[PDB]
């Protein structure tokens, strides 16, 4: 049960990422995190395969809207989230 | 391709309220809400038909431009079963 | 029943605007909004005439304290506020 | 011209607490509170007589300057019926 | 010199979650939590033995560097009676 | 019963200051304050002597981690805090 995240500059690029990820595979949206400097992180949860597929599609879709600052998959054993 | 989310991201809140007003008066769109992400950035979100949403965002963006900076303008067509599920809310 | 707003860089310029607007005409102070980057929006509600008079006086008074970033009147039919 | 609001806006919180202390010890002014607006900006607000408020803000600004940056210093004379009504509180 | 606090401060949240994961898998350290201070800065805090904490922070910092910027890496040895008392929590 | 504070750029430098202050003298940690721009203020309370000793040690320790923006002691008569 992996965690996946797309970090963007702008919220529009983050919602675009969230839409692309959930349509792409069997992943559940955990939520959003605002850390300032116009930075928003979109977090998904699901099996490793579904998470890797979702983040690649979420990053590719956000890229067309705004600047993607980070794309990452953590195949974890939600304790690690804020 | 029937249901959609629309957004106008501005630098300044006045430009965002101006966008929200122009959107709802220009097309058959319902205001979902606002989001503050820091750096003076505010996102205005609307919901309605893809055609209505594309028309609202173009009018929202044009009206906000007269007040402040518009940083982003975007339309996301949605499945219609859980249109608002992808929003932070 | 119009909405009026003065957006400033600095809070002192915003409180100065709020004071000038409420003394100028029959307008009710809705509140303040902080959006970061030192930006503060002062919002008033009242009839269109009273709102246009208040915002012109609020902008002119704030100008003497700090930098006014936006001045606007919306003659609306509070649903549109955050 | 009898009741007034006073403010000292600083870059840094230490300079703001230093201003608040200098204000209350220098003149017959009551501390209303603080406001954080981002960009490291903090506003200290005082209430009292116009004369006392002008004297407190000058001492608050001078004391804060030794600690940090002072971005704004201002006095607003108020009607006395609803002195604090204009504040965000 | 037995109990310690460790921290990795990053620009970006993804780099912070990556640090948190690398820390807990690399050494016998417990994740305390996160702190957002603005400017896109996030601090990840761990608790454990001084040796384990120095090993976790080095692995957390190295793993975060592959994702984003690491702004600070630090180890604070603690008395063991009230290890977490100094944290903002 | 004085107030003492160390203002830093970064949270790590602030926690380092808090640790150095509490070990240095008989001072109680009031708390932390985040004002944005990566600025964090660490506040202590105790007798004037203990507070002056704590802030000097807290500033010296933070200096080795990050940039200290302010160091100050107020020998007060907690009303003055946010």
Curated annotation (Swiss-Prot), chains B, D, E:
Deletion phenotype: Cells do not make BMCs, diol dehydratase is found in diffuse aggregates near the cell pole; it was later found this a double pduA-pduBB' deletion. A single deletion forms larger than normal BMCs; it is not fully complemented by protein produced from a plasmid. Grows in an interrupted manner on 1,2-PD and vitamin B12; grows for a while then stops, then restarts as toxic propionaldehyde accumulates and then decreases. Increased DNA mutagenesis, showing propionaldehyde is a mutagen.
Domain remarks: The C-terminal 14 residues mediate binding to the N-terminus of PduP, which encapsulates PduP into BMCs.
PANTHER family in alphabetical order: BACTERIAL MICROCOMPARTMENT SHELL PROTEIN PDUJ (PTHR33941:SF11), PROPANEDIOL UTILIZATION PROTEIN PDUA (PTHR33941)
Induction (free text): The first gene in the pdu operon. BMC production is induced by growth on 1,2-PD vitamin B12 medium. No change when grown in the presence of 1,2-PD, ethanolamine and vitamin B12, suggesting it is possible for both the eut and pdu operons to be expressed at the same time.
Protein name according to UniProt: Bacterial microcompartment shell protein PduA
Domain BMC: start-end pairs: 4-88
Effect of residue 54 to A: Slow growth at limiting vitamin B12, wild-type at saturating conditions
Organism: Salmonella typhimurium (strain LT2 / SGSC1412 / ATCC 700720)
Listed result of changing residue 28 to A: Subject to propionaldehyde toxicity, makes about 75% BMCs, shells are wrinkled and leaky
Lineage: superkingdom: Bacteria
Coiled-coil intervals, chain numbering: none
Subcellular location: Bacterial microcompartment
SUPFAM superfamilies membership: CcmK-like
Keywords: Bacterial microcompartment, Transport
Consequence of substituting residue 80 to A: Decreased amounts of PduP in purified BMCs
Family: Belongs to the bacterial microcompartments protein family.
Complex and partners: Homohexamer with a central pore of about 5.6 Angstroms in diameter. The hexamers pack against each other in arrays. Interacts with the N-terminus of PduP which targets PduP to the BMC. Modeling suggests PduC, PduD, PduE, PduL and PduP interact with a cleft formed by the C-terminal segments of 2 adjacent PduA subunits (on the BMC luminal side) in the hexamer.
UniProt GO BP: propanediol catabolic process
Function description: One of the major shell proteins of the bacterial microcompartment (BMC) dedicated to 1,2-propanediol (1,2-PD) degradation. At least one of PduA or PduJ is required for BMC assembly; it must be encoded as the first gene in the pdu operon. Not required for structural integrity of BMCs, it is required to mitigate propionaldehyde toxicity. Controls diffusion of 1,2-PD into and propionaldehyde out of the BMC shell; residue 40 is particularly important for pore permeability. The 1,2-PD-specific bacterial microcompartment (BMC) concentrates low levels of 1,2-PD catabolic enzymes, concentrates volatile reaction intermediates thus enhancing pathway flux and keeps the level of toxic, mutagenic propionaldehyde low.
Biotechnology (record note): Artificial BMCs can be made in E.coli by expressing pduA-pduB/B'-pduT-pduU-pduN-pduJ-pduK (in this order). Enzymes can be targeted to the BMC, and appear to be encapsulated within it. Upon overexpression and mixing of purified sheets with 2-ethyl-1-hexanol, will form closed shells. Enzymes (tested with endogenous BMC enzyme DDH and the peroxidase activity of cytC) can be encapsulated in the shells; the enzyme is active in the shells. The shells are permeable to a variety of compounds, showing they could be used to make protein based synthetic bioreactors.
């Amino acid at each position: 049960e992996a965690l996946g995240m797309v970090e963007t500059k702008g919220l529009t690029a983050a919602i675009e990422a969230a839409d692309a990820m959930v349509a792409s595979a069997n992943v559940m949206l955990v939520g959003y995190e605002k850390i300032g400097l116009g930075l928003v992180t979109v977090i998904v949860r699901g099996d490793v395969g579904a998470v890797k597929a979702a983040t690649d599609a979420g990053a590719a879709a956000a890229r067309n809207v705004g600047e993607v600052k980070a794309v990452h998959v953590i195949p974890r054993p939600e304790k690690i989230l804020p």
